PDB file of all heavy atoms in Angstrom:
ATOM      1  N   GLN C1060       0.826  -1.219  -0.010  1.00  9.08           N
ATOM      2  CA  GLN C1060       0.013  -0.021   0.008  1.00  9.08           C
ATOM      3  C   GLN C1060       0.846   1.253   0.001  1.00  9.08           C
ATOM      4  O   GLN C1060       1.794   1.392   0.800  1.00  9.08           O
ATOM      5  CB  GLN C1060      -0.935  -0.008   1.208  1.00  9.08           C
ATOM      6  CG  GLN C1060      -2.120   0.937   1.059  1.00  9.08           C
ATOM      7  CD  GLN C1060      -3.147   0.716   2.185  1.00  9.08           C
ATOM      8  OE1 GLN C1060      -3.010   1.218   3.282  1.00  9.08           O
ATOM      9  NE2 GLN C1060      -4.213  -0.033   1.843  1.00  9.08           N
ATOM     10  N   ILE C1061       0.534   2.179  -0.909  1.00  6.01           N
ATOM     11  CA  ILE C1061       1.088   3.515  -0.922  1.00  6.01           C
ATOM     12  C   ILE C1061      -0.040   4.541  -0.958  1.00  6.01           C
ATOM     13  O   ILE C1061      -0.928   4.433  -1.812  1.00  6.01           O
ATOM     14  CB  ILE C1061       2.054   3.735  -2.127  1.00  6.01           C
ATOM     15  CG1 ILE C1061       3.090   2.619  -2.164  1.00  6.01           C
ATOM     16  CG2 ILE C1061       2.671   5.100  -2.069  1.00  6.01           C
ATOM     17  CD1 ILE C1061       4.206   2.826  -3.201  1.00  6.01           C
ATOM     18  N   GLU C1062      -0.026   5.481  -0.030  1.00  4.45           N
ATOM     19  CA  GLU C1062      -1.051   6.487   0.033  1.00  4.45           C
ATOM     20  C   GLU C1062      -0.494   7.853   0.395  1.00  4.45           C
ATOM     21  O   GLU C1062       0.412   7.965   1.249  1.00  4.45           O
ATOM     22  CB  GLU C1062      -2.103   6.073   1.103  1.00  4.45           C
ATOM     23  CG  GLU C1062      -3.254   5.243   0.541  1.00  4.45           C
ATOM     24  CD  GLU C1062      -4.166   4.721   1.658  1.00  4.45           C
ATOM     25  OE1 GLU C1062      -3.980   5.127   2.844  1.00  4.45           O
ATOM     26  OE2 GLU C1062      -5.041   3.874   1.328  1.00  4.45           O
ATOM     27  N   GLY C1063      -1.001   8.864  -0.262  1.00  2.00           N
ATOM     28  CA  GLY C1063      -0.700  10.222   0.022  1.00  2.00           C
ATOM     29  C   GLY C1063       0.237  10.929  -0.934  1.00  2.00           C
ATOM     30  O   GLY C1063       0.221  10.650  -2.171  1.00  2.00           O
ATOM     31  N   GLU C1064       1.037  11.822  -0.394  1.00  2.00           N
ATOM     32  CA  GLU C1064       1.884  12.704  -1.150  1.00  2.00           C
ATOM     33  C   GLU C1064       3.115  12.038  -1.754  1.00  2.00           C
ATOM     34  O   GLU C1064       3.629  11.087  -1.166  1.00  2.00           O
ATOM     35  CB  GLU C1064       2.297  13.889  -0.283  1.00  2.00           C
ATOM     36  CG  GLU C1064       2.907  15.051  -1.060  1.00  2.00           C
ATOM     37  CD  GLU C1064       3.063  16.257  -0.160  1.00  2.00           C
ATOM     38  OE1 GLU C1064       2.057  16.887   0.214  1.00  2.00           O
ATOM     39  OE2 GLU C1064       4.204  16.621   0.169  1.00  2.00           O
ATOM     40  N   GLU C1065       3.525  12.489  -2.932  1.00  2.00           N
ATOM     41  CA  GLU C1065       4.768  11.975  -3.567  1.00  2.00           C
ATOM     42  C   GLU C1065       5.906  12.262  -2.585  1.00  2.00           C
ATOM     43  O   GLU C1065       5.995  13.338  -2.017  1.00  2.00           O
ATOM     44  CB  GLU C1065       5.011  12.681  -4.875  1.00  2.00           C
ATOM     45  CG  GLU C1065       5.972  11.910  -5.783  1.00  2.00           C
ATOM     46  CD  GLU C1065       6.665  12.782  -6.835  1.00  2.00           C
ATOM     47  OE1 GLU C1065       6.174  13.910  -7.053  1.00  2.00           O
ATOM     48  OE2 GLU C1065       7.664  12.331  -7.391  1.00  2.00           O
ATOM     49  N   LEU C1066       6.764  11.266  -2.414  1.00  2.00           N
ATOM     50  CA  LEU C1066       7.823  11.357  -1.416  1.00  2.00           C
ATOM     51  C   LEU C1066       9.217  11.043  -2.000  1.00  2.00           C
ATOM     52  O   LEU C1066       9.404  10.060  -2.725  1.00  2.00           O
ATOM     53  CB  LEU C1066       7.540  10.397  -0.278  1.00  2.00           C
ATOM     54  CG  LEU C1066       8.544  10.348   0.875  1.00  2.00           C
ATOM     55  CD1 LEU C1066       8.550  11.645   1.704  1.00  2.00           C
ATOM     56  CD2 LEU C1066       8.339   9.112   1.744  1.00  2.00           C
ATOM     57  N   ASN C1067      10.173  11.865  -1.611  1.00  2.00           N
ATOM     58  CA  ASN C1067      11.599  11.578  -1.827  1.00  2.00           C
ATOM     59  C   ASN C1067      12.364  12.000  -0.588  1.00  2.00           C
ATOM     60  O   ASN C1067      12.521  13.166  -0.299  1.00  2.00           O
ATOM     61  CB  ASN C1067      12.091  12.348  -3.070  1.00  2.00           C
ATOM     62  CG  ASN C1067      11.682  11.676  -4.375  1.00  2.00           C
ATOM     63  OD1 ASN C1067      12.271  10.714  -4.840  1.00  2.00           O
ATOM     64  ND2 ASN C1067      10.632  12.207  -4.979  1.00  2.00           N
ATOM     65  N   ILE C1068      12.856  11.001   0.145  1.00  2.00           N
ATOM     66  CA  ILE C1068      13.469  11.243   1.461  1.00  2.00           C
ATOM     67  C   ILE C1068      14.746  10.452   1.575  1.00  2.00           C
ATOM     68  O   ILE C1068      14.884   9.349   1.016  1.00  2.00           O
ATOM     69  CB  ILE C1068      12.477  10.865   2.585  1.00  2.00           C
ATOM     70  CG1 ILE C1068      13.072  11.304   3.943  1.00  2.00           C
ATOM     71  CG2 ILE C1068      12.182   9.355   2.565  1.00  2.00           C
ATOM     72  CD1 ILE C1068      12.033  11.237   5.066  1.00  2.00           C
ATOM     73  N   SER C1069      15.702  10.972   2.340  1.00  2.00           N
ATOM     74  CA  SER C1069      16.958  10.283   2.612  1.00  2.00           C
ATOM     75  C   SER C1069      17.168  10.097   4.107  1.00  2.00           C
ATOM     76  O   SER C1069      16.597  10.795   4.938  1.00  2.00           O
ATOM     77  CB  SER C1069      18.141  11.113   2.049  1.00  2.00           C
ATOM     78  OG  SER C1069      17.876  11.494   0.713  1.00  2.00           O
ATOM     79  N   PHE C1070      17.991   9.077   4.413  1.00  2.00           N
ATOM     80  CA  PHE C1070      18.224   8.709   5.820  1.00  2.00           C
ATOM     81  C   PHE C1070      19.402   7.730   5.946  1.00  2.00           C
ATOM     82  O   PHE C1070      19.847   7.201   4.919  1.00  2.00           O
ATOM     83  CB  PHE C1070      16.951   8.016   6.414  1.00  2.00           C
ATOM     84  CG  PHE C1070      16.446   6.888   5.577  1.00  2.00           C
ATOM     85  CD1 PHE C1070      16.901   5.589   5.768  1.00  2.00           C
ATOM     86  CD2 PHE C1070      15.534   7.106   4.561  1.00  2.00           C
ATOM     87  CE1 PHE C1070      16.417   4.555   4.999  1.00  2.00           C
ATOM     88  CE2 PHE C1070      15.070   6.035   3.790  1.00  2.00           C
ATOM     89  CZ  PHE C1070      15.502   4.779   4.012  1.00  2.00           C
ATOM     90  N   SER C1071      19.906   7.595   7.158  1.00  2.00           N
ATOM     91  CA  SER C1071      21.023   6.661   7.362  1.00  2.00           C
ATOM     92  C   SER C1071      20.495   5.193   7.374  1.00  2.00           C
ATOM     93  O   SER C1071      19.545   4.920   8.099  1.00  2.00           O
ATOM     94  CB  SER C1071      21.717   6.993   8.699  1.00  2.00           C
ATOM     95  OG  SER C1071      22.697   5.998   9.023  1.00  2.00           O
ATOM     96  N   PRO C1072      21.123   4.363   6.582  1.00  2.00           N
ATOM     97  CA  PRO C1072      20.574   2.998   6.448  1.00  2.00           C
ATOM     98  C   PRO C1072      20.565   2.177   7.720  1.00  2.00           C
ATOM     99  O   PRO C1072      19.692   1.368   7.937  1.00  2.00           O
ATOM    100  CB  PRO C1072      21.493   2.339   5.408  1.00  2.00           C
ATOM    101  CG  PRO C1072      22.295   3.439   4.807  1.00  2.00           C
ATOM    102  CD  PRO C1072      22.401   4.511   5.845  1.00  2.00           C
ATOM    103  N   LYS C1073      21.585   2.442   8.585  1.00  2.00           N
ATOM    104  CA  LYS C1073      21.736   1.687   9.800  1.00  2.00           C
ATOM    105  C   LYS C1073      20.533   1.861  10.726  1.00  2.00           C
ATOM    106  O   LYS C1073      20.004   0.868  11.242  1.00  2.00           O
ATOM    107  CB  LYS C1073      22.971   2.183  10.571  1.00  2.00           C
ATOM    108  CG  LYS C1073      23.375   1.290  11.745  1.00  2.00           C
ATOM    109  CD  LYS C1073      23.909   2.061  12.899  1.00  2.00           C
ATOM    110  CE  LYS C1073      23.996   1.206  14.166  1.00  2.00           C
ATOM    111  NZ  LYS C1073      24.269   1.993  15.372  1.00  2.00           N
ATOM    112  N   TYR C1074      20.079   3.113  10.891  1.00  2.00           N
ATOM    113  CA  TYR C1074      18.936   3.412  11.737  1.00  2.00           C
ATOM    114  C   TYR C1074      17.681   2.664  11.259  1.00  2.00           C
ATOM    115  O   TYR C1074      16.932   2.106  12.048  1.00  2.00           O
ATOM    116  CB  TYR C1074      18.658   4.914  11.804  1.00  2.00           C
ATOM    117  CG  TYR C1074      19.855   5.716  12.255  1.00  2.00           C
ATOM    118  CD1 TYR C1074      19.993   7.028  11.780  1.00  2.00           C
ATOM    119  CD2 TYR C1074      20.768   5.215  13.115  1.00  2.00           C
ATOM    120  CE1 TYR C1074      21.092   7.773  12.176  1.00  2.00           C
ATOM    121  CE2 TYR C1074      21.860   5.958  13.568  1.00  2.00           C
ATOM    122  CZ  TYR C1074      21.982   7.245  13.080  1.00  2.00           C
ATOM    123  OH  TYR C1074      23.091   8.024  13.473  1.00  2.00           O
ATOM    124  N   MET C1075      17.448   2.741   9.936  1.00  2.00           N
ATOM    125  CA  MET C1075      16.311   2.042   9.346  1.00  2.00           C
ATOM    126  C   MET C1075      16.455   0.562   9.590  1.00  2.00           C
ATOM    127  O   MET C1075      15.471  -0.045  10.054  1.00  2.00           O
ATOM    128  CB  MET C1075      16.249   2.353   7.853  1.00  2.00           C
ATOM    129  CG  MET C1075      15.112   1.614   7.107  1.00  2.00           C
ATOM    130  SD  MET C1075      13.459   2.065   7.719  1.00  2.00           S
ATOM    131  CE  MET C1075      13.026   3.325   6.488  1.00  2.00           C
ATOM    132  N   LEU C1076      17.606  -0.017   9.293  1.00  2.00           N
ATOM    133  CA  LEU C1076      17.825  -1.457   9.462  1.00  2.00           C
ATOM    134  C   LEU C1076      17.657  -1.920  10.897  1.00  2.00           C
ATOM    135  O   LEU C1076      17.126  -3.041  11.119  1.00  2.00           O
ATOM    136  CB  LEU C1076      19.238  -1.835   8.996  1.00  2.00           C
ATOM    137  CG  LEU C1076      19.434  -1.821   7.463  1.00  2.00           C
ATOM    138  CD1 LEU C1076      20.906  -2.146   7.149  1.00  2.00           C
ATOM    139  CD2 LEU C1076      18.562  -2.849   6.787  1.00  2.00           C
ATOM    140  N   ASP C1077      18.073  -1.096  11.855  1.00  2.00           N
ATOM    141  CA  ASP C1077      17.899  -1.415  13.242  1.00  2.00           C
ATOM    142  C   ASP C1077      16.414  -1.504  13.634  1.00  2.00           C
ATOM    143  O   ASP C1077      15.978  -2.450  14.305  1.00  2.00           O
ATOM    144  CB  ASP C1077      18.589  -0.416  14.148  1.00  2.00           C
ATOM    145  CG  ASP C1077      20.100  -0.542  14.133  1.00  2.00           C
ATOM    146  OD1 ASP C1077      20.610  -1.638  13.857  1.00  2.00           O
ATOM    147  OD2 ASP C1077      20.827   0.466  14.429  1.00  2.00           O
ATOM    148  N   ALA C1078      15.676  -0.531  13.171  1.00  2.00           N
ATOM    149  CA  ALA C1078      14.217  -0.493  13.478  1.00  2.00           C
ATOM    150  C   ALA C1078      13.498  -1.717  12.841  1.00  2.00           C
ATOM    151  O   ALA C1078      12.671  -2.312  13.491  1.00  2.00           O
ATOM    152  CB  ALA C1078      13.601   0.794  12.951  1.00  2.00           C
ATOM    153  N   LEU C1079      13.880  -2.060  11.645  1.00  5.89           N
ATOM    154  CA  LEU C1079      13.207  -3.171  10.921  1.00  5.89           C
ATOM    155  C   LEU C1079      13.449  -4.511  11.570  1.00  5.89           C
ATOM    156  O   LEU C1079      12.522  -5.358  11.692  1.00  5.89           O
ATOM    157  CB  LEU C1079      13.665  -3.210   9.490  1.00  5.89           C
ATOM    158  CG  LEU C1079      13.388  -2.041   8.531  1.00  5.89           C
ATOM    159  CD1 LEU C1079      13.843  -2.331   7.120  1.00  5.89           C
ATOM    160  CD2 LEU C1079      11.935  -1.643   8.541  1.00  5.89           C
ATOM    161  N   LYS C1080      14.655  -4.745  12.026  1.00  7.66           N
ATOM    162  CA  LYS C1080      15.040  -6.042  12.618  1.00  7.66           C
ATOM    163  C   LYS C1080      14.250  -6.334  13.877  1.00  7.66           C
ATOM    164  O   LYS C1080      14.014  -7.459  14.252  1.00  7.66           O
ATOM    165  CB  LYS C1080      16.534  -6.050  12.970  1.00  7.66           C
ATOM    166  CG  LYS C1080      17.416  -6.321  11.765  1.00  7.66           C
ATOM    167  CD  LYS C1080      18.802  -5.741  11.978  1.00  7.66           C
ATOM    168  CE  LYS C1080      19.584  -5.834  10.687  1.00  7.66           C
ATOM    169  NZ  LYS C1080      21.004  -5.354  10.878  1.00  7.66           N
ATOM    170  N   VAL C1081      13.823  -5.256  14.529  1.00 11.38           N
ATOM    171  CA  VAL C1081      13.237  -5.344  15.840  1.00 11.38           C
ATOM    172  C   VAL C1081      11.712  -5.389  15.796  1.00 11.38           C
ATOM    173  O   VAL C1081      11.043  -5.684  16.782  1.00 11.38           O
ATOM    174  CB  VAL C1081      13.705  -4.060  16.699  1.00 11.38           C
ATOM    175  CG1 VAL C1081      13.038  -4.049  18.099  1.00 11.38           C
ATOM    176  CG2 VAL C1081      15.179  -4.050  16.822  1.00 11.38           C
ATOM    177  N   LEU C1082      11.166  -5.226  14.614  1.00 12.94           N
ATOM    178  CA  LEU C1082       9.739  -5.313  14.409  1.00 12.94           C
ATOM    179  C   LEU C1082       9.290  -6.670  13.911  1.00 12.94           C
ATOM    180  O   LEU C1082       9.701  -7.120  12.863  1.00 12.94           O
ATOM    181  CB  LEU C1082       9.277  -4.228  13.441  1.00 12.94           C
ATOM    182  CG  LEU C1082       9.442  -2.793  13.935  1.00 12.94           C
ATOM    183  CD1 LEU C1082       9.072  -1.782  12.828  1.00 12.94           C
ATOM    184  CD2 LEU C1082       8.652  -2.536  15.191  1.00 12.94           C
ATOM    185  N   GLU C1083       8.439  -7.319  14.672  1.00 15.12           N
ATOM    186  CA  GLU C1083       7.864  -8.588  14.310  1.00 15.12           C
ATOM    187  C   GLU C1083       6.705  -8.321  13.346  1.00 15.12           C
ATOM    188  O   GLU C1083       6.107  -7.241  13.333  1.00 15.12           O
ATOM    189  CB  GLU C1083       7.356  -9.366  15.552  1.00 15.12           C
ATOM    190  CG  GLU C1083       8.288  -9.322  16.737  1.00 15.12           C
ATOM    191  CD  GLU C1083       7.638  -9.875  18.007  1.00 15.12           C
ATOM    192  OE1 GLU C1083       6.811  -9.198  18.573  1.00 15.12           O
ATOM    193  OE2 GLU C1083       7.981 -11.000  18.411  1.00 15.12           O
ATOM    194  N   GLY C1084       6.373  -9.306  12.489  1.00 12.79           N
ATOM    195  CA  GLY C1084       5.307  -9.164  11.573  1.00 12.79           C
ATOM    196  C   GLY C1084       5.753  -9.164  10.135  1.00 12.79           C
ATOM    197  O   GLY C1084       6.914  -8.736   9.831  1.00 12.79           O
ATOM    198  N   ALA C1085       4.866  -9.579   9.207  1.00 17.29           N
ATOM    199  CA  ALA C1085       5.226  -9.645   7.787  1.00 17.29           C
ATOM    200  C   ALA C1085       5.207  -8.251   7.151  1.00 17.29           C
ATOM    201  O   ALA C1085       5.799  -8.050   6.071  1.00 17.29           O
ATOM    202  CB  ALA C1085       4.228 -10.570   7.084  1.00 17.29           C
ATOM    203  N   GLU C1086       4.536  -7.313   7.765  1.00 19.97           N
ATOM    204  CA  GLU C1086       4.384  -5.956   7.254  1.00 19.97           C
ATOM    205  C   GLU C1086       4.973  -4.896   8.169  1.00 19.97           C
ATOM    206  O   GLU C1086       5.051  -5.099   9.378  1.00 19.97           O
ATOM    207  CB  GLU C1086       2.904  -5.637   7.027  1.00 19.97           C
ATOM    208  CG  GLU C1086       2.297  -6.266   5.777  1.00 19.97           C
ATOM    209  CD  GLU C1086       0.855  -5.831   5.533  1.00 19.97           C
ATOM    210  OE1 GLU C1086       0.090  -5.826   6.533  1.00 19.97           O
ATOM    211  OE2 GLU C1086       0.556  -5.494   4.401  1.00 19.97           O
ATOM    212  N   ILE C1087       5.303  -3.764   7.612  1.00 21.33           N
ATOM    213  CA  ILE C1087       5.703  -2.568   8.363  1.00 21.33           C
ATOM    214  C   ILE C1087       5.014  -1.347   7.790  1.00 21.33           C
ATOM    215  O   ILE C1087       4.768  -1.233   6.594  1.00 21.33           O
ATOM    216  CB  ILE C1087       7.201  -2.406   8.351  1.00 21.33           C
ATOM    217  CG1 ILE C1087       7.831  -3.494   9.217  1.00 21.33           C
ATOM    218  CG2 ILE C1087       7.620  -1.020   8.873  1.00 21.33           C
ATOM    219  CD1 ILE C1087       9.320  -3.506   9.205  1.00 21.33           C
ATOM    220  N   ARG C1088       4.658  -0.429   8.714  1.00 22.88           N
ATOM    221  CA  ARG C1088       4.019   0.807   8.332  1.00 22.88           C
ATOM    222  C   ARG C1088       5.017   1.951   8.513  1.00 22.88           C
ATOM    223  O   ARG C1088       5.416   2.305   9.635  1.00 22.88           O
ATOM    224  CB  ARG C1088       2.787   1.042   9.198  1.00 22.88           C
ATOM    225  CG  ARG C1088       1.928   2.297   8.899  1.00 22.88           C
ATOM    226  CD  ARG C1088       0.727   2.393   9.766  1.00 22.88           C
ATOM    227  NE  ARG C1088      -0.176   3.496   9.353  1.00 22.88           N
ATOM    228  CZ  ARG C1088      -0.493   4.551  10.118  1.00 22.88           C
ATOM    229  NH1 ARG C1088      -0.033   4.613  11.374  1.00 22.88           N
ATOM    230  NH2 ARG C1088      -1.306   5.484   9.650  1.00 22.88           N
ATOM    231  N   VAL C1089       5.411   2.550   7.388  1.00 21.08           N
ATOM    232  CA  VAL C1089       6.311   3.723   7.398  1.00 21.08           C
ATOM    233  C   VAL C1089       5.493   4.960   7.048  1.00 21.08           C
ATOM    234  O   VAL C1089       4.915   5.058   5.995  1.00 21.08           O
ATOM    235  CB  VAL C1089       7.498   3.578   6.438  1.00 21.08           C
ATOM    236  CG1 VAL C1089       8.661   4.421   6.909  1.00 21.08           C
ATOM    237  CG2 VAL C1089       7.930   2.132   6.324  1.00 21.08           C
ATOM    238  N   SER C1090       5.472   5.922   8.013  1.00 19.07           N
ATOM    239  CA  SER C1090       4.649   7.119   7.866  1.00 19.07           C
ATOM    240  C   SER C1090       5.575   8.332   7.673  1.00 19.07           C
ATOM    241  O   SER C1090       6.423   8.568   8.517  1.00 19.07           O
ATOM    242  CB  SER C1090       3.758   7.268   9.094  1.00 19.07           C
ATOM    243  OG  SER C1090       2.940   6.130   9.285  1.00 19.07           O
ATOM    244  N   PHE C1091       5.328   9.115   6.602  1.00 20.34           N
ATOM    245  CA  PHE C1091       6.144  10.285   6.333  1.00 20.34           C
ATOM    246  C   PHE C1091       5.300  11.578   6.267  1.00 20.34           C
ATOM    247  O   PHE C1091       4.106  11.532   6.012  1.00 20.34           O
ATOM    248  CB  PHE C1091       6.834  10.135   4.984  1.00 20.34           C
ATOM    249  CG  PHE C1091       7.646   8.821   4.870  1.00 20.34           C
ATOM    250  CD1 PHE C1091       7.064   7.739   4.425  1.00 20.34           C
ATOM    251  CD2 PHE C1091       9.011   8.879   5.205  1.00 20.34           C
ATOM    252  CE1 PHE C1091       7.843   6.505   4.288  1.00 20.34           C
ATOM    253  CE2 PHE C1091       9.733   7.702   5.112  1.00 20.34           C
ATOM    254  CZ  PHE C1091       9.180   6.509   4.660  1.00 20.34           C
ATOM    255  N   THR C1092       6.000  12.671   6.500  1.00 19.36           N
ATOM    256  CA  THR C1092       5.445  14.006   6.371  1.00 19.36           C
ATOM    257  C   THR C1092       6.496  14.921   5.759  1.00 19.36           C
ATOM    258  O   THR C1092       6.970  15.781   6.412  1.00 19.36           O
ATOM    259  CB  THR C1092       4.851  14.574   7.653  1.00 19.36           C
ATOM    260  OG1 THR C1092       4.491  13.552   8.585  1.00 19.36           O
ATOM    261  CG2 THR C1092       3.616  15.345   7.386  1.00 19.36           C
ATOM    262  N   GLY C1093       6.839  14.692   4.541  1.00 15.17           N
ATOM    263  CA  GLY C1093       7.871  15.468   3.843  1.00 15.17           C
ATOM    264  C   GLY C1093       9.234  14.846   3.972  1.00 15.17           C
ATOM    265  O   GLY C1093       9.428  13.840   4.661  1.00 15.17           O
ATOM    266  N   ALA C1094      10.218  15.457   3.344  1.00 17.16           N
ATOM    267  CA  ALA C1094      11.581  14.924   3.290  1.00 17.16           C
ATOM    268  C   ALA C1094      12.405  15.216   4.468  1.00 17.16           C
ATOM    269  O   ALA C1094      13.430  14.513   4.705  1.00 17.16           O
ATOM    270  CB  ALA C1094      12.264  15.485   2.031  1.00 17.16           C
ATOM    271  N   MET C1095      12.053  16.200   5.300  1.00 19.19           N
ATOM    272  CA  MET C1095      12.937  16.658   6.379  1.00 19.19           C
ATOM    273  C   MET C1095      12.320  16.421   7.770  1.00 19.19           C
ATOM    274  O   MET C1095      13.057  16.620   8.784  1.00 19.19           O
ATOM    275  CB  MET C1095      13.233  18.123   6.172  1.00 19.19           C
ATOM    276  CG  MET C1095      13.975  18.410   4.878  1.00 19.19           C
ATOM    277  SD  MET C1095      14.876  19.981   4.865  1.00 19.19           S
ATOM    278  CE  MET C1095      15.628  19.922   3.257  1.00 19.19           C
ATOM    279  N   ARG C1096      11.085  16.062   7.852  1.00 18.70           N
ATOM    280  CA  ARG C1096      10.469  15.766   9.169  1.00 18.70           C
ATOM    281  C   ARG C1096      10.755  14.306   9.547  1.00 18.70           C
ATOM    282  O   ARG C1096      10.826  13.442   8.734  1.00 18.70           O
ATOM    283  CB  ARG C1096       8.963  15.965   9.074  1.00 18.70           C
ATOM    284  CG  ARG C1096       8.476  17.384   9.474  1.00 18.70           C
ATOM    285  CD  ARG C1096       6.995  17.477   9.460  1.00 18.70           C
ATOM    286  NE  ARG C1096       6.359  16.614  10.453  1.00 18.70           N
ATOM    287  CZ  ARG C1096       5.021  16.506  10.648  1.00 18.70           C
ATOM    288  NH1 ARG C1096       4.169  17.259   9.937  1.00 18.70           N
ATOM    289  NH2 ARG C1096       4.570  15.672  11.562  1.00 18.70           N
ATOM    290  N   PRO C1097      10.966  14.101  10.887  1.00 20.61           N
ATOM    291  CA  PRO C1097      11.083  12.715  11.388  1.00 20.61           C
ATOM    292  C   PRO C1097       9.951  11.828  10.940  1.00 20.61           C
ATOM    293  O   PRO C1097       8.801  12.215  11.063  1.00 20.61           O
ATOM    294  CB  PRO C1097      11.061  12.933  12.932  1.00 20.61           C
ATOM    295  CG  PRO C1097      11.624  14.286  13.135  1.00 20.61           C
ATOM    296  CD  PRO C1097      11.209  15.116  11.944  1.00 20.61           C
ATOM    297  N   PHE C1098      10.304  10.661  10.434  1.00 19.55           N
ATOM    298  CA  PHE C1098       9.276   9.701  10.000  1.00 19.55           C
ATOM    299  C   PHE C1098       9.184   8.562  10.986  1.00 19.55           C
ATOM    300  O   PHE C1098      10.092   8.363  11.817  1.00 19.55           O
ATOM    301  CB  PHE C1098       9.592   9.147   8.620  1.00 19.55           C
ATOM    302  CG  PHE C1098      10.936   8.514   8.445  1.00 19.55           C
ATOM    303  CD1 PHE C1098      11.120   7.176   8.487  1.00 19.55           C
ATOM    304  CD2 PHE C1098      12.057   9.332   8.262  1.00 19.55           C
ATOM    305  CE1 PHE C1098      12.362   6.589   8.350  1.00 19.55           C
ATOM    306  CE2 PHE C1098      13.315   8.781   8.132  1.00 19.55           C
ATOM    307  CZ  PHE C1098      13.462   7.398   8.168  1.00 19.55           C
ATOM    308  N   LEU C1099       8.057   7.806  10.912  1.00 19.20           N
ATOM    309  CA  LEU C1099       7.818   6.726  11.878  1.00 19.20           C
ATOM    310  C   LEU C1099       7.851   5.357  11.222  1.00 19.20           C
ATOM    311  O   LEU C1099       7.508   5.257  10.044  1.00 19.20           O
ATOM    312  CB  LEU C1099       6.472   6.944  12.574  1.00 19.20           C
ATOM    313  CG  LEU C1099       6.334   8.171  13.490  1.00 19.20           C
ATOM    314  CD1 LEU C1099       4.917   8.271  14.022  1.00 19.20           C
ATOM    315  CD2 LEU C1099       7.327   8.087  14.658  1.00 19.20           C
ATOM    316  N   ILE C1100       8.256   4.390  11.977  1.00 21.00           N
ATOM    317  CA  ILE C1100       8.136   2.956  11.517  1.00 21.00           C
ATOM    318  C   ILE C1100       7.353   2.203  12.579  1.00 21.00           C
ATOM    319  O   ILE C1100       7.661   2.267  13.772  1.00 21.00           O
ATOM    320  CB  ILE C1100       9.577   2.324  11.336  1.00 21.00           C
ATOM    321  CG1 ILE C1100      10.448   3.220  10.463  1.00 21.00           C
ATOM    322  CG2 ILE C1100       9.413   0.968  10.666  1.00 21.00           C
ATOM    323  CD1 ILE C1100      11.235   4.249  11.282  1.00 21.00           C
ATOM    324  N   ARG C1101       6.359   1.475  12.083  1.00 20.53           N
ATOM    325  CA  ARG C1101       5.478   0.741  12.981  1.00 20.53           C
ATOM    326  C   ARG C1101       4.931  -0.503  12.293  1.00 20.53           C
ATOM    327  O   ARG C1101       5.181  -0.712  11.090  1.00 20.53           O
ATOM    328  CB  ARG C1101       4.299   1.630  13.417  1.00 20.53           C
ATOM    329  CG  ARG C1101       4.675   2.816  14.275  1.00 20.53           C
ATOM    330  CD  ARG C1101       3.503   3.764  14.518  1.00 20.53           C
ATOM    331  NE  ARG C1101       3.102   4.510  13.320  1.00 20.53           N
ATOM    332  CZ  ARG C1101       2.263   5.519  13.338  1.00 20.53           C
ATOM    333  NH1 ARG C1101       1.651   5.852  14.454  1.00 20.53           N
ATOM    334  NH2 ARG C1101       2.021   6.146  12.182  1.00 20.53           N
TER     335      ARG C1101
END
């Protein structure tokens, strides 16, 4: 699923990878609000 505004964002891969490893489940929800605001992983 992709919903909302067109997005182009950058980040450090390590932080993303750390968050992903720690989340159980077949799916993850990544929520963005622009390229420079903190995004969420759930």
Side-chain angles (χ1 to χ4, degrees):
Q1060 199 170 81
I1061 307 188
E1062 271 173 6
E1064 193 170 290
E1065 201 204 344
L1066 179 72
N1067 284 278
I1068 188 168
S1069 311
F1070 53 90
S1071 173
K1073 190 217 168 190
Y1074 304 149
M1075 178 63 97
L1076 286 175
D1077 286 336
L1079 297 185
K1080 280 155 191 186
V1081 175
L1082 295 176
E1083 317 170 287
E1086 284 185 313
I1087 289 175
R1088 181 177 188 242
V1089 205
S1090 304
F1091 306 90
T1092 335
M1095 300 200 177
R1096 269 183 62 180
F1098 55 100
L1099 293 177
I1100 310 88
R1101 294 174 287 189

